Amino acid sequence: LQLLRNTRIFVSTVKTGHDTTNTQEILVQDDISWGQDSNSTDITVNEAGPRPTRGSKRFNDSLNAAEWSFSTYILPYEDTTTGKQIVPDYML
């Protein structure tokens, strides 16, 4: 079973040919959240009279856009190969 604490996050500029430059692991605090959600449309006949029809139908219509959030400590450091300062999430 998927345990949330085992979660790891990688971001990339690309779908393929991932490398140490186009792709970056990031730290998180354990307050991460993510997901996607469904919009569903329900219809029923409004009827008069003594012996009305009664049922209903519904249809899945569309999805909302996916949403994500996470939080991170600010952590400036010196890039060991260049002597420049960076933070791990500069790509963001």
Q: Any contact of residue 43 with another protein (CB under 8 A)?
A: yes
Interacting residue with another protein among 41, 64, 71, 85 (CB under 8 A): 41
Q: Any contact of residue 14 with another protein (CB under 8 A)?
A: no
Interacting residue with another protein among 1, 3, 48, 66 (CB under 8 A): 48
Site for another protein in 50-79 (CB under 8 A): 50-51, 53, 57, 59
Cβ atoms of 23 and 14 within 8 Å: the answer is: yes
Cβ atoms of 51 and 57 within 8 Å: the answer is: no
Q: Any contact of residue 47 with another protein (CB under 8 A)?
A: yes
With CA atoms as reference, report the closest residue to 70 among 4, 23, 1, 15: 4
Q: Any contact of residue 13 with another protein (CB under 8 A)?
A: no
Interacting residue with another protein among 46, 56, 69, 80 (CB under 8 A): 46
- Residues 78 and 84: their CA atoms lie apart, in Å, by 5
What are the structure tokens assigned to 44, written together? 């029923």
Terminal-residue alpha carbon distance, the chain: 31
Binding residues (CB under 8 A) for another protein: these are 41, 43, 45-51, 53, 57, 59
